[PDB]
Amino acid sequence: APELESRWPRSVVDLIDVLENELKRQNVSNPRELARKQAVALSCFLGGRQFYIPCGDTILTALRDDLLYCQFNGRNMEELRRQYRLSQPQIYQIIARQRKLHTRRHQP
């Protein structure tokens, strides 16, 4: 049965909902139809091929990282370390990185 599902399109189905919950959350008109055509593009784009999808929050780091730099206010280095369960080295690194990032924004 699992091996039967191995080549099963069940994965396709699982995805329309993955698209649904963000589209419904973002509140756009007509979830279902938008997401199915949305999937068809992926099917043609990625038909019959090995693909590494960035796994296990790697993208979510970048968004976790952006908010943290926004809440870094110069003396709360302990506060956001509890509330993200991160550590001193992590905090320092992200801080310096996003600081350079914004400095490229303010500076030409």
- Give how far the C-alpha of residue 58 lies from the chain's centroid of Cα atoms, to the nearest Å: 7
Among 14, 25, 30, 48, binds DNA (CB under 7 A): 48
Is 14 annotated to bind ligand?
Answer: yes
- Give the residue with the Cβ less far from DNA, 26 or 50: 50
Q: Would you say 83 and 90 are in contact if contact means Cβ atoms under 8 Å apart?
A: no
Q: Would you say 95 and 72 are in contact if contact means Cβ atoms under 8 Å apart?
A: yes
Judged by CB under 7 A, the number of residues near DNA is 13
Identify the residue whose tokens are 């191995």: 6
- Give the residue with the Cβ less far from DNA, 83 or 93: 93
Identify the residue whose tokens are 């069940």: 10
Contact between 34 and DNA by CB under 7 A: the answer reads no
- Give the residue with the Cβ less far from DNA, 34 or 95: 95
**CB 27 to DNA: min, Å:** 33
Among 15, 16, 34, 86, binds DNA (CB under 7 A): 86
- Give how far the C-alpha of residue 93 lies from the chain's centroid of Cα atoms, to the nearest Å: 20
